[PDB]
Write an enzyme that holds these catalytic residues in place. Structure first.
Site, mmCIF file in Angstrom:
data_model
loop_
_atom_site.group_PDB
_atom_site.id
_atom_site.type_symbol
_atom_site.label_atom_id
_atom_site.label_comp_id
_atom_site.label_asym_id
_atom_site.label_seq_id
_atom_site.Cartn_x
_atom_site.Cartn_y
_atom_site.Cartn_z
ATOM 1 N N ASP A 141 25.031 -4.594 0.548
ATOM 2 C CA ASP A 141 24.035 -4.353 -0.492
ATOM 3 C C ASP A 141 24.668 -3.861 -1.797
ATOM 4 O OD1 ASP A 141 21.484 -5.195 0.179
ATOM 5 O OD2 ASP A 141 20.879 -3.285 1.123
ATOM 6 N N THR A 171 30.970 6.477 -1.504
ATOM 7 C CA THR A 171 30.400 5.807 -0.351
ATOM 8 C C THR A 171 29.140 5.076 -0.877
ATOM 9 O OG1 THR A 171 29.777 6.136 2.025
ATOM 10 C CG2 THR A 171 29.059 7.830 0.496
ATOM 11 N N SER A 172 28.596 4.119 -0.134
ATOM 12 C CA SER A 172 27.387 3.417 -0.614
ATOM 13 C C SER A 172 26.170 4.355 -0.699
ATOM 14 C CB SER A 172 27.093 2.145 0.206
ATOM 15 O OG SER A 172 26.436 2.443 1.434
ATOM 16 N N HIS A 188 -22.635 24.304 9.185
ATOM 17 C CA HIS A 188 -22.893 23.568 10.440
ATOM 18 C C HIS A 188 -23.927 22.456 10.258
ATOM 19 C CE1 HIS A 188 -21.310 27.320 12.470
ATOM 20 N NE2 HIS A 188 -21.948 27.855 11.444
ATOM 21 N N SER A 233 -27.065 -4.724 0.958
ATOM 22 C CA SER A 233 -26.682 -5.262 -0.353
ATOM 23 C C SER A 233 -26.754 -6.789 -0.328
ATOM 24 C CB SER A 233 -25.279 -4.799 -0.768
ATOM 25 O OG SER A 233 -25.081 -3.409 -0.532
ATOM 26 N N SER A 234 -26.337 -7.376 0.796
ATOM 27 C CA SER A 234 -26.555 -8.802 1.044
ATOM 28 C C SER A 234 -28.043 -9.110 1.260
ATOM 29 C CB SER A 234 -25.735 -9.259 2.262
ATOM 30 O OG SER A 234 -26.266 -8.762 3.490
#
Lengths: 447, 447
Positions: free
Chosen positions: A82, A114-115, A163, A281-282
């Site tokens: 990479d 280091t990577s 509650h 709604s439909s």
């Protein structure tokens, strides 16, 4: 696009697309180029291994980091193991400059590193910029709306439920203030977390660095590198990897923020369900659903699943490292996209809210029994004993209403000074709200 | 006791028993009595509803809080909302049995204006605060101290690193323990900065009762004073019937991150012991198992199960509250017991640890391939190009040993100044440790 599996890059792409600048292969390649270039710029300004190049040659070096295009990213992926492709990309761009200056120093690209030196700094800068530029401001947009709601409706009386059952009155502004206060607190905690990085070579110990330059103080030197070139805190102690503890802290903080917002989403669903709020709604033409709050509720839970994963797996890396950390880390973007999707839905939702005054006041006027406590409090102030049991006895077998409560005051509390009697008879559920209105309008001030 | 279902109160009772002072029905009853007494002491010193009692009457009142015995607790449970009303009756009875006309008058002010969550949240806050500060954090700090002692004592002792489980550039045992010190130091600091909060705002969070009882009192300031003066607690002004619990979540997240660091430590030590690099001071007479680290590993995972539970459920309480929060909160004691059990095992484990020098040294001397990098960096310092590929070509088909690496140096690196050549020939895996020794011994100062 339509064939994408993840809803992040599928149906929610427009809502979270601005995250691609911080979290994506493109963003990752880009920031690695920037880190490698600045490492070389730093080695040049310190003159550890070579003498400083010309002012124009630094400018040409710096330009590799500043002008990063889609074709630059395309060339890196072509080389891809990479970060070695990134290292190759920078060297090539220095070779194609034909400056003898840079052809000499090319070989110092990735020197000592280091990577994970490159990646941890790249992630750190991406996470820091993302939070400060995109994510936290989005949360701060939510707090602003909550504050405005707190002030606007500070006085509007609302029957509490404990509650699920009727209780002493509050105001809608007050209930919104409580959420402001919680999120204000979470945001402060999150911005106090210091984003950290390291740059210590293979195993955390400057093994390579010590052999390369024996008299360099590498702790102070890397401190300088990280502060000067990235404005990052330096975590000195590491293995091959940075410990990730700061990521865990941030994600814990965002997860607590998200839990507060889930609480908010559910309460608003509940107020809307009780007909106390309306959304601007439909089959049913006047049915209006709180879908913004429901959609947010779900995406906050998903965000938190990722956050719980991070803080449980990120702390463990076998010995001087195992690689499982890096596939997980690749998902910080996703985690924050689910956050962002949710935060935008909460905002869409909050901007549709209006009170339903008539319904708020009707409910309060049907719940006169919530005046039980202030009557008892006043009785006890004038030395009454067993005030509760007296009200209990009087209401035995009755459906408590306004006439019953005010009859209780007239006949059972007549021993009180008549000014006090008159004050109790003036009380209504809507008018028994304590300092709710004071507390809602002063929430910002009282932080 | 042997019939107990929970190992908290079963097999681990001796390891975690000191927690029952903070977390148990006994501890809870005890702290509730204290809250009620101090509330009445505060009402007296403010003279909100009555004129101050005699100096000796306050002394008799305060004594109900200071001398709390097992028989006092027995008396409360005998009387046993249903929980705190027994406490309320207990204090009233003790004031009645005093035969002082002073206290006979003021006993009706016991629990005046309070909801039961006013009492409980302060009791919980005081128990949690004292437990963390007196038992839990000091146990963590004992682990820190041992890690520091290990870091210094073994700062110089070389150890072959492993990345992906495979040999890598050398470290020291002291350095590896110092990384853990640094992480734990950080977690402890974050945890000590969390402010333990409480409220005392009546039925619904808004001082409804308070306002009718005393209309010109500023209850925000008043409760701020109460909570600071009598308990040294921060006041979270904004609440419903319940305190939001957000600080509990912060604390538990903080303890959970500490625990994840300790899991990492537990696994690494298991692995070092497995690799025969550390020693610990039914069939196999010389088999010695790292059981302390194993037991801790398991109990840390359990502690974190509770903490993840808290931070995910505590944030949600429907409207002005649902009661589900209260059963959950009853488990903070259990969660902290699993913490304490594991922290004591980590301590027991760390005190048995010794290095196995002979084993440490032989492993390093079987891994001369880890000198690949310092050779390459020295070559590149003197303008060598493709150093990696040169070593790779030379070792192709060979089993890399000391002879091979030192032959590479002699013949392939001979272009270097002969002082540098002999510096490379002086290198051993055990002496390529970078600043591990310096970083280990200075961890307290540098981290």
């Amino acid at each position: 696009h339509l064939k994408n599996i993840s809803p992040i890059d599928g149906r929610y792409k427009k809502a979270c697309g601005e995250l691609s600048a911080f979290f994506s292969e493109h963003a990752l390649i880009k920031h690695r180029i920037i880190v490698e270039v600045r490492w070389l710029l730093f080695l040049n300004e310190e003159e550890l291994f070579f003498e400083k190049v010309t002012d124009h040659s630094v400018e040409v070096l710096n330009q590799i980091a500043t002008n990063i295009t889609d074709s630059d990213i395309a060339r890196v992926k072509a080389i891809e193991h990479d970060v070695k492709a990134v290292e190759y990309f920078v060297k090539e761009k220095l070779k194609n400059s034909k400056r003898e200056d840079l052809l000499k120093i090319k070989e110092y690209v990735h020197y000592l590193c280091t990577s994970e030196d490159i990646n941890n700094v790249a992630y750190a800068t991406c996470l820091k910029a993302c939070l400060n530029d995109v994510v936290i401001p989005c949360l701060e947009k939510i707090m602003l709306k909550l504050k405005d709601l707190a002030v606007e409706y500070s006085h509007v009386p609302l029957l509490s439920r404990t509650h699920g059952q009727p209780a002493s009155s509050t105001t809608f502004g007050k209930e919104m203030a409580n959420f402001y206060a919680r999120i204000h607190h979470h945001v402060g905690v999150i911005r106090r977390v210091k984003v950290c990085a390291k740059f210590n070579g293979a195993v955390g110990n400057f093994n390579a660095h010590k052999v390369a330059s024996k008299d360099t103080d590498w702790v102070n030197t890397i401190g300088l590198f990280l502060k000067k070139h990235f404005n990052l805190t330096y975590s000195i102690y590491c293995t091959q990897i940075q410990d990730h503890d700061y990521i865990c802290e941030l994600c814990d903080g965002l997860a607590r923020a998200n839990g507060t917002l889930i609480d908010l989403c559910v309460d608003i669903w509940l107020y809307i369900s009780n007909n106390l709020l309306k959304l601007k709604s439909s089959t049913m033409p006047h049915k209006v659903n709180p879908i913004d709050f429901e959609n947010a509720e779900g995406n906050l839970h998903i965000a938190n699943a990722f956050f719980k994963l991070f803080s449980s797996k990120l702390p463990t890396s076998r010995l001087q490292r195992d690689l499982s950390d890096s596939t997980v880390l690749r998902n910080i973007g996703s985690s924050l996209a689910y956050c962002l999707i949710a935060y935008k839905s909460v905002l869409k939702g909050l901007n549709k809210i209006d009170i339903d005054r008539r319904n708020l006041e009707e409910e309060l006027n049907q719940n006169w029994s919530t005046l039980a406590e202030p009557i008892q409090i006043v009785m006890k102030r004038h030395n009454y004993v067993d005030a509760y049991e007296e009200l209990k006895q009087f209401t035995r077998g009755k459906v408590i209403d306004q006439k019953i409560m005010q009859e209780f005051i007239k006949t059972k509390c007549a021993f009180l000074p008549q000014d006090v009697v008159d004050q109790l008879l003036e009380l209504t559920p809507a008018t028994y709200t304590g300092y709710a209105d004071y507390l809602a309008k002063n929430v910002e001030r009282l932080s």
